[PDB]
Amino acid sequence: PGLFLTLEGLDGSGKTTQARRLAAFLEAQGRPVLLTREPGGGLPEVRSLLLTQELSPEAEYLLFSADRAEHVRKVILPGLAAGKVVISDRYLDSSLAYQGYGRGLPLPWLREVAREATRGLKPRLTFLLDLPPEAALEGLGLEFFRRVREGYLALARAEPGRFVVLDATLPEEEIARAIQAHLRPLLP
Amino acid sequence: PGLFLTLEGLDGSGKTTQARRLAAFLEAQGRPVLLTREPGGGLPEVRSLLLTQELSPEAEYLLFSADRAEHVRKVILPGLAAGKVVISDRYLDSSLAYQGYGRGLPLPWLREVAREATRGLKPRLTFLLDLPPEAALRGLGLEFFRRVREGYLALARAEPGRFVVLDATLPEEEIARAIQAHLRPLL
Ligand SMILES: Cc1cn([C@H]2C[C@H](O)[C@@H](COP(=O)(O)O)O2)c(=O)[nH]c1=O
Ligand SMILES: Cc1cn([C@H]2C[C@H](O)[C@@H](COP(=O)(O)O)O2)c(=O)[nH]c1=O
Ligand SMILES: [Cl-]
Ligand SMILES: [Cl-]
Ligand SMILES: [Mg+2]
Ligand SMILES: [Mg+2]
Ligand SMILES: [Mg+2]
Ligand SMILES: [Mg+2]
Ligand SMILES: [Mg+2]
Ligand SMILES: [Mg+2]
Ligand SMILES: [Mg+2]
Ligand SMILES: [Mg+2]
C-alpha cells in the first residue's frame, strides 16, 4: 500500500517549494503523508561528506547511494507500509542526472549500485520541474547544469509514464495545480 | 610500475604489525614504500562516522566504497605511479568478508560496485593473517566473526595465486619472515 512520489529538478527550480506545498495539500485532504528528502533523509551526516574538496565523482555517487540505501530502508519503505503518501524531494533520478549526465559516470553502473540500494523501489510519479540551466559539490557551473538539465529531460522521455515534466518558470500556484491534477486519479 | 600488496584478517590478527614490519624490510632494501589503510585512507570522515554509528549493511558497504574510491585515486594509484610499493592494511577483500560473508550482502553486487570504485585495481599479493576470533589479540556474538573468518578463507581458496594464508598465532618475527619469503620473487 501507500503511494511513493518524488520531485526533481535543478537547484532553484522550485521543486522544494512544490514538495512542501504538495505535502500540505494532501494532509489537508486527511491523507497520511511523510515528507522527506535527499541527500540526508537516510544518513544526515552525508551532507558533510559530500562537501569534501576534490571528491571523485565515483565517491560522490557512492555517498549519495549510502544515504539512499538507509533512506529507503528506514524511512520510505516503512512509511509506504503504513499506507502513507511518501514524498521525497529528490531521489535516484537526481543521481542519474547529476552524477550520470553531469559528472559523466556510466548509467548502467549507477543503476546496478542502485538496484540493492533502493531494493528496486520506484516512485509512481516523479514531478520534474524543468528550469533553464542558467537559472540554477564542486564544479557546478553552467556547462554542468546544461548537461544535468538535458539529462533530466532524457530521463523523462525514457520513462514518460512516470515523469511529469513541468515548466519551472510558471507561477508556483499554477505548477501546484498541475501537480494536483495529475494526482487526483491516484488519490480520490 | 609500483607493486600493490594488501594485508587482511580479523582485527587483532596482526595484519597491522605485519604491515609495519614489511615496510621496514622494504626500507632496509632501499625500496620506496607507502603504507596506508582502510577505512579512512580516502575519507577520514567515513572512518569516524562508522566508528560511532551503525547502518544497514548496504549503506555501510557504500560508505566503505566511497572511502575506497578516494583511497585508490588519491593515495594508492599515485604511490604506484611513483614506483612505490604500496601496502594497504585492508582493501576490497575486507568488504567481501565483513559485508558479504559476515552481513550477507551478495558478492557479485559487491564486486560490481567495486569495479568502478577501484578502477579495477587489484593487489598482486594479499597476506591473510588467519586465526580464530577467540585468538585475536584485539558466545553468540562470535558467530558473526566466524562468518568473517571463514569468508576470508573462502576468498583465499578461490584465488590461491593472489592470497598467501599465514598462521597468525605464530610469533611475529616468524610471520614476517614468511611474508618476506613469499615476496622476494616479486621484487
Ligand atoms: C540527491 C542528490 C542530490 N544531488 C545534488 C543536488 C544539489 O546540488 C545537492 C543537494 O544539496 P542540498 O543538500 O544543499 O540541497 O546535491 C546530487 O548531485 N545527486 C543526488 O543524488
Ligand atoms: C575496510 C573495511 C573495514 N571494515 C571494518 C572491519 C573492522 O571492524 C573495522 C576496522 O576499522 P578501524 O580499524 O578503523 O577501527 O572496519 C569493514 O567492515 N569493511 C571494510 O570494507
Ligand atoms: Cl529547489
Ligand atoms: Cl590487526
Ligand atoms: Mg543510488
Ligand atoms: Mg525521483
Ligand atoms: Mg545496470
Ligand atoms: Mg574483526
Ligand atoms: Mg568497494
Ligand atoms: Mg585485500
Ligand atoms: Mg562465512
Ligand atoms: Mg571457509
From Swiss-Prot, chain B:
ATP binds at G9, L10, D11, G12, S13, G14, K15, T16. Its EC number is 2.7.4.9. It catalyses: dTMP + ATP = dTDP + ADP. It comes from the Bacteria. One of its GO terms (biological process) is dUDP biosynthetic process. One of its GO terms (molecular function) is dTMP kinase activity. PROSITE patterns: THYMIDYLATE_KINASE. Phosphorylation of dTMP to form dTDP in both de novo and salvage pathways of dTTP synthesis. This is Thymidylate kinase. It comes from Thermus thermophilus (strain ATCC 27634 / DSM 579 / HB8).
